[PDB]
Amino acid sequence: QDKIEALSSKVQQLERSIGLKDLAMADLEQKVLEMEASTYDGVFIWKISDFARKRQEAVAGRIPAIFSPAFYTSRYGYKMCLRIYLNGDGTGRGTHLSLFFVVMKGPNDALLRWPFNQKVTLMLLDQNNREHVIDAFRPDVTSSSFQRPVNDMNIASGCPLFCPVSKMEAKNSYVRDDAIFIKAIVDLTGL
């Protein structure tokens, strides 16, 4: 009667202790991965593997968008990430590959100037280094995308008509080994 409950008690407590562990670890893993991808010079190269599958999940509406890992303008600069719609968003829904920029809440924001006002250049690399698709934009100092973060992420903004889909879904040099490379360069003028 007491022999059973004693073992049972231990059982529970043991199962609980084991759980609070995997949670912190699943967490720590995510942290390590993020650190592995970050840069601190405003230049970021994002490799998106399993393009075919991710390309489908977007057409089938299962997974419309994907965020990229975060990167920075400098060791203690702004925090930013990218977001892509493999089958278009807004004026690009179903016809283009829509790509956006995202200002994030960083650890040093209180030491930075707001609103964010740096030029941003986005590229879809040609793995045949012949013709990289490129586009750029300057932030609208009045938009709420470039205002100091109250939330983890502000509203994204960028290029809804960044690149035509057909320019992928055929014989091209942007998709090699079922993966594409997106590149972003944040102009550092005045920083």
Binding site: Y85, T91, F100, F137, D140, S143, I155, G158, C159, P160
Partner: peptide
């Protein structure tokens, strides 16, 4: 473009 302004996702 000079400065195409960015557009918000939607």
């Amino acid at each position: 473009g000079q400065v195409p302004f960015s557009k918000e996702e939607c």
